[PDB]
Amino acid sequence: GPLGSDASTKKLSESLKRIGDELDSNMELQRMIATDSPREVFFRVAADMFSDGNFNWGRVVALFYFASKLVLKA
């Protein structure tokens, strides 16, 4: 409503809109859902995502974006 809130909300929504579309247009992902135990796929992908020791929340969210399509779609 207020002008300060409307602008900060707009900028934040666009930034999250951009990251959201990057996940949905991830072509390496779209090809992976297409030897296929979902648990093993999840653990092999999850192991590779965190092999460098960095376990941050954005990576976990991306991992569960992957898990949702892996479980529900395929």
Taking phi first (over 0 means left), then psi (-120 to 50 degrees means alpha), and beta for anything else, what does residue 53 get? left
Nearest CA-CA partner of 42 in 60, 57, 22? 60
* Amino acid (one-letter) located at 7: A
Binding at 36: pick from Zn ion, its own copies, none (beta carbon under 5-8 Å per type): Zn ion
Least Å from the CB of residue 60 to Zn ion: 18
Least Å from the CB of residue 43 to its own copies: 7
What sign does the dihedral 29-32-38-44 (CA atoms) show? Answer: negative
Least Å from the CB of residue 52 to Zn ion: 18
Interacting residue ranges for its own copies, rule: CB under 8 A: 5-6, 8-17, 19-26, 28-29, 32-33, 38-39, 41-50, 52-74
